[PDB]
Amino acid sequence: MRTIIALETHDVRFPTSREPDPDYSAAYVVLRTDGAEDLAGYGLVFTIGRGNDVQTAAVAALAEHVVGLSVDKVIADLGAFARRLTNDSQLRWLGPEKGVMHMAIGAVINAAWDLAARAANKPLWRFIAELTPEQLVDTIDFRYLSDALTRDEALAILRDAQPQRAARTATLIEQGYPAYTTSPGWLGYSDEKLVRLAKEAVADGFRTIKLKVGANVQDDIRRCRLARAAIGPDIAMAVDANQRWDVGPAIDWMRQLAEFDIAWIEEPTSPDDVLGHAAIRQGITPVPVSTGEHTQNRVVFKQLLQAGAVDLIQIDAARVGGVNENLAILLLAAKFGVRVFPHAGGVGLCELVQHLAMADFVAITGKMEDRAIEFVDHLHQHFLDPVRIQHGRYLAPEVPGFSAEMHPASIAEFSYPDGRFWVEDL
Amino acid sequence: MRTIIALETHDVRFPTSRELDGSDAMNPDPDYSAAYVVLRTDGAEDLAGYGLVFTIGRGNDVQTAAVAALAEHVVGLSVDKVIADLGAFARRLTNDSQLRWLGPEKGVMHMAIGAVINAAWDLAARAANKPLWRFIAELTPEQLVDTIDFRYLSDALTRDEALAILRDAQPQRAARTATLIEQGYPAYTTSPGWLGYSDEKLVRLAKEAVADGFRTIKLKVGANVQDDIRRCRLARAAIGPDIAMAVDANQRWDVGPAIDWMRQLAEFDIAWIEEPTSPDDVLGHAAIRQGITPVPVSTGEHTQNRVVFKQLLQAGAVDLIQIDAARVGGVNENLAILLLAAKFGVRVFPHAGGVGLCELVQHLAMADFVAITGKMEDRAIEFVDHLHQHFLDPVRIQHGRYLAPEVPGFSAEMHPASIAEFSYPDGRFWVE
Ligand SMILES: [Mg+2]
Ligand SMILES: [Mg+2]
């Protein structure tokens, strides 16, 4: 009987600040077993430097809950495993289901799913999409959701899609999943660099681009005008304010960019302000509003949808309670007819989130041409299964797992502080 | 130059689960703990700041780690510079991009920031030789407003809207200060109501409390409806019809069930039902409130920040709210919340208990009475009779009322001996 023998945590930090000034980092989690040498679950929480140590401590504090557990028991009931962590009332106090403690639980949960897909020798998106509607529904926590999504409503959705799974899988495997780029929209970029990168993005096949705004309206008006012209009237152009504005200012601001045909304004205000996003959306119609990369859990997503605060949402592989929670968010969006545009970038976020969007297309919505996954070309060289883009689209992962395992030489080089690079640097 | 020379932290926890004190529907065996922090400066050793984060056992070590990670931001700062601008000090921590990523303004990292901010206010209070409530209540309306973060609030509470509140109350500050020191502040107790206690114990404690002068008691509910009906009926009979009785479900229910459940308890004359559902479900609370009317609804002990309180008030989701001294971004954030409540006319019943939350929160409610609302007879501060012996300035209850603190500070300082005794895991008591 194979069991989990250890939950090792690694404080990995990349000096990306030498290339605000975020130093991309990751609280690297590994679920070790005594089975086939190749059996281990990998996961990670994306941090930006300061605090990766506290995030690591949080993950390491979960060891007691996992060491000694039978692997088959875990893999057989991922729902019960996630709930063993989420239901610890004492750990709930540090949240509940938000912040550092929840993200730590999410990474351990993610590693468990990674482990499950590995054992079944399937890429996560396939592992997920090939579970029965009953197996899928049993992994989600319906507490606090019965007013918007019942177990039965979840089952009907998964059952209707059941018949088309084979066709969707073939479609994805040959066509790939759409991607959008944010590479051209950095605020520090000159107008010429903006148009130049915008043009290159289109040439590479991307059909949607996103620019940052929020610092200076005059600047935003000028950059949006230039981007539109450089891109043409057929490419989608979204904007990201990164939580900068209050409600009134956001409305005044966005009304001045509407003319450039905005795909959507992302995070106009605080990620906790459900009613504010609704207010902004109403004040700038028909400019679509989105949020989600920092949304704490499925309950807040529920309210965003209930209040009609969003036109579309982002989901993040590492911000919530792992796969289990994202499935509930995905079912929620599907039920309310709201598109999902996964957030990525950071450290391995693309590698992780691609699977959730792909499982979603096959087993939940069957729609992908109306949306896209974010893509950023960073740190991919540190992963065994790096994402692959082909003319603006993600190629479906083939290797088994969640695509989270990083090259051991990478961990040996950037582990902090014992890492080779950090030992010499300081 | 007086400087902050160190930020020391301690993982302290008490075996409160041995008697099931604090026992409730969501937390069956809490071990009251504290992520204790001390802001050390050079010079008058009597000059340091104290604060803590209340935890209930497991995870208190990571909460402690969270606070220790803030040393870098505070050690080396000029004491005078900190105390002279609490608004800037708070923003230095709150506005840090890498710290915000772990939240922002929620969870472990935020409570860690809130403890350091609270310790800074304690420091400021000491330096001025004033207990925190008077320190706060005596700041000018201008000085007060400059301590809060109005970001994400302009649609509910603008800076000038806040000044109007604080200025109309400045004239009567002296009188109310008198009323407070003479009469004390209304309290209510939760000690008789922990789940886990037998019916016989519930009735004995409920009666003792009334005998002790408490005009309000609170019972934990939420695990089993039959139990709740039975316990509420008995507690009501033990208390008599003139004593208020509130109920606390500790987030256990979904909206639909909460409505069905509470309407069955309504007959026992419920003062308010606290946290019927998830602390993030603003819409859910309003839904529950509309369905169980006229039974009052409250929430707040786990509300992450002022932005969520703003929405609770805008959505008419509560009849009254709790504030907690250690849940948010310290005094600065609590002041904003108190101002929001006053502008929306919703009473505040502070959450207390755990470890030293009574010691801490009493100051906020008292400054509120004096400098903001001028209202205290319509509300009360929670009181639990546990662990007060480990504080140098323990709360003092006089016939169901909190007596105004007199010593300078936030009342957070703990006996060095208590620390040495219950520090985890290498503490003396924890060596068995
Ligand atoms: Mg974004
Ligand atoms: Mg409570």
Curated annotation (Swiss-Prot), chain B:
A molecular function GO annotation: hydro-lyase activity
Record keywords, A-Z: Lyase, Magnesium, Metal-binding
Enzymatic class: lyase
Cofactor comment: Binds 1 Mg(2+) ion per subunit.
Binding site for Mg(2+): 248, 274, 301
A GO BP annotation: carbohydrate catabolic process
The protein's assembly and partners: Homodimer.
Family: Belongs to the mandelate racemase/muconate lactonizing enzyme family.
Protein name: L-fuconate dehydratase
